[PDB]
Design an enzyme around this catalytic site. Structure first.
Site, mmCIF file in Angstrom:
data_model
loop_
_atom_site.group_PDB
_atom_site.id
_atom_site.type_symbol
_atom_site.label_atom_id
_atom_site.label_comp_id
_atom_site.label_asym_id
_atom_site.label_seq_id
_atom_site.Cartn_x
_atom_site.Cartn_y
_atom_site.Cartn_z
ATOM 1 C CB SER A 136 -3.080 3.795 -33.309
ATOM 2 O OG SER A 136 -2.827 3.705 -34.451
ATOM 3 C CG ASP B 12 0.741 11.361 -32.470
ATOM 4 O OD1 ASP B 12 1.078 11.474 -33.660
ATOM 5 O OD2 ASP B 12 -0.285 10.560 -32.163
HETATM 6 C C1 LIG Z 1 4.227 3.563 -39.554
HETATM 7 C C2 LIG Z 1 4.082 3.878 -38.134
HETATM 8 C C3 LIG Z 1 2.841 2.894 -37.382
HETATM 9 C C4 LIG Z 1 3.297 3.579 -36.015
HETATM 10 C C5 LIG Z 1 3.441 5.086 -36.386
HETATM 11 C C6 LIG Z 1 4.676 4.874 -37.162
HETATM 12 O O1 LIG Z 1 5.196 6.181 -37.889
HETATM 13 C C7 LIG Z 1 5.833 4.070 -36.678
HETATM 14 C C8 LIG Z 1 5.807 3.076 -35.630
HETATM 15 C C9 LIG Z 1 4.281 2.807 -34.938
HETATM 16 C C10 LIG Z 1 3.783 2.210 -34.071
HETATM 17 C C11 LIG Z 1 4.266 0.725 -33.475
HETATM 18 C C12 LIG Z 1 3.483 -0.150 -32.588
HETATM 19 C C13 LIG Z 1 2.008 0.579 -32.129
HETATM 20 O O2 LIG Z 1 1.211 -0.429 -32.706
HETATM 21 C C14 LIG Z 1 1.792 1.982 -32.399
HETATM 22 C C15 LIG Z 1 0.257 2.104 -32.266
HETATM 23 C C16 LIG Z 1 2.789 2.926 -31.835
HETATM 24 O O3 LIG Z 1 2.761 3.474 -30.582
HETATM 25 O O4 LIG Z 1 4.140 3.007 -32.574
HETATM 26 C C17 LIG Z 1 2.248 2.184 -33.910
HETATM 27 C C18 LIG Z 1 1.727 3.710 -34.754
HETATM 28 C C19 LIG Z 1 0.477 3.597 -35.230
HETATM 29 O O5 LIG Z 1 -0.105 2.704 -35.793
HETATM 30 O O6 LIG Z 1 -0.117 4.893 -34.840
#
Ligand SMILES: C=C1C[C@]23C[C@@]1(O)CCC2[C@@]12C=C[C@H](O)[C@@](C)(C(=O)O1)[C@H]2[C@@H]3C(=O)O
Lengths: 59, 338
Positions: free
Chosen positions: B186, B284
């Site tokens: 991310s 994604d």
């Molecule tokens: C608002 C957000 C933040 C997400 C995308 C989302 O739409 C929903 C859930 C996220 C998240 C949660 C934990 C992890 O840090 C992350 C990198 C993932 O895979 O999923 C996280 C991911 C991110 O930060 O890219």
């Protein structure tokens, strides 16, 4: 009887209740898209079943 | 309107619960006016302390890299061989033993606003990296937006990189140099790219970058963004929110911090840049930006290995219950030890 893959991540969920937790998450999303954080600070965030159940009520 | 049956078809149920729980919680933390509920965010996040006691062959300890900003980083190391007693606070910086000992400088994800080095999801990921790659991992607790926006996160990564590169106890026997690899998922992947750029402009030679579902964007609405919006945990609305919280006031998504291949970005043609392993989840919504990133590197003549997992979603690497996780961990190990 807890899901160990979630437990290592800090979340406590019984394997047999995974589907019920999944249901609650969607029910909470539904309510949010139709609408809180003040009362949330009092709930135990690790116990997902009860956390979600408590949030649903507040809505 | 809300119907999440579709996203449940592509991931294991426990993975779905984990990511969906973050999804709902983060909806609460993000405010329409651009403010963030930091107090609640840090209360909800599940955190863990360091532990000098080896667990699954891995132990850890926290280090204060810079006081002025209270920048912490957690170091993860494989258990010492022939250890009669657990490491005391005076045994934590024992010189690495091995001709080649890779050190992964890791930056956690969370779209620049969420999580910490001590968040359980990332402490667990780092521990797995140590055991699956047989190496040392240093996880940076970089400052988060909106309170500490661009370029704070990059500055923290630079400070951490220099700290790592200057540790005598992290030098490999072969060339008496610290073998550094930058990694991040991310926003952490975005940070790795930018820290690598700054490294090349100095005297630090990074051996490689590992980007997992790296967070990049631009002004244009790609096809994947329009077609996958809200179907698999992520929405264009929240993506826009995080970019606005991170980027300078008045800026747009063509700022180099958002789009590394923006017309405003410096060309990578003939530049000293490390080899890259870019992992892209097919479900994604910013998939097109990530694919464009890998293509940008290749076009600039950089060494790039692309792993496009067509049925993977964001967060696939948080639980070891799917082939995407296994395949990726195998490639990361091969990449670092090559
Ligand atoms: C608002 C957000 C933040 C997400 C995308 C989302 O739409 C929903 C859930 C996220 C998240 C949660 C934990 C992890 O840090 C992350 C990198 C993932 O895979 O999923 C996280 C991911 C991110 O930060 O890219």
């Amino acid at each position: 009887g807890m899901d160990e893959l979630l437990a290592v991540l800090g979340y406590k969920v019984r394997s047999s209740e995974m589907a019920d937790v999944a249901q609650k998450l969607e029910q909470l999303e539904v309510m949010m898209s139709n609408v809180l954080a003040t009362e949330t600070v009092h709930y135990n965030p690790a116990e997902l079943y009860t956390w979600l159940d408590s949030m649903l009520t507040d809505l | 309107e809300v119907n999440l049956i579709e996203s449940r078809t592509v991931v294991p149920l426990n993975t779905w619960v984990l990511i969906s729980n973050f999804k709902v919680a983060y909806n609460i933390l993000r405010r329409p006016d651009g403010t963030f509920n930091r107090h609640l965010a840090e209360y909800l996040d599940r955190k863990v302390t360091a532990n000098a006691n080896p667990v699954d062959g891995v132990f850890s300890f926290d280090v204060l890299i810079d006081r002025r900003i209270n920048l912490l980083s957690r170091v993860y190391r494989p258990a010492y061989a022939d250890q009669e007693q657990p490491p005391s606070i005076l045994d934590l910086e024992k010189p690495v033993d091995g001709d080649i000992v890779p050190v992964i400088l890791f930056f956690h994800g969370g779209s620049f606003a969420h999580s910490s080095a001590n968040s359980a999801i990332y402490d667990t990921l780092c521990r797995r990296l140590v055991g699956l790659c047989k190496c040392v991992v240093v996880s940076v607790n970089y400052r988060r937006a909106p309170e500490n926006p661009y370029p704070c996160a990059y500055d923290d990564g630079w400070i951490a990189l220099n700290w790592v590169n200057s540790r005598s106890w992290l030098k490999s026997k072969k060339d008496s140099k610290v073998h550094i690899f930058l990694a991040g998922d991310s926003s952490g992947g975005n940070i790795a790219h930018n820290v690598a750029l700054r490294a090349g402009e100095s005297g630090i030679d990074v051996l490689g970058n590992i980007l997992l579902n790296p967070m990049f964007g631009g002004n244009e609405r790609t096809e994947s963004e329009k077609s996958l919006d809200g179907k698999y945990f992520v929405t264009v609305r929240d993506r826009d929110w995080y970019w606005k919280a991170f980027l300078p006031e008045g800026e747009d998504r063509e700022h180099p911090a958002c789009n590394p291949f923006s017309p405003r970005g410096k060309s990578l043609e003939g530049v000293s840049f490390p080899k890259s392993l870019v992992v892209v989840a097919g479900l994604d919504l910013i998939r097109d930006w990530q694919l464009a990133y890998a293509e940008g590197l290749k076009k600039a003549g950089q060494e790039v290995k692309l792993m496009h997992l067509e049925k993977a979603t964001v967060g696939f690497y948080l639980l070891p219950n799917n082939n995407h996780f296994h395949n990726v961990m195998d490639e990361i190990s091969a990449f670092v030890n090559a």
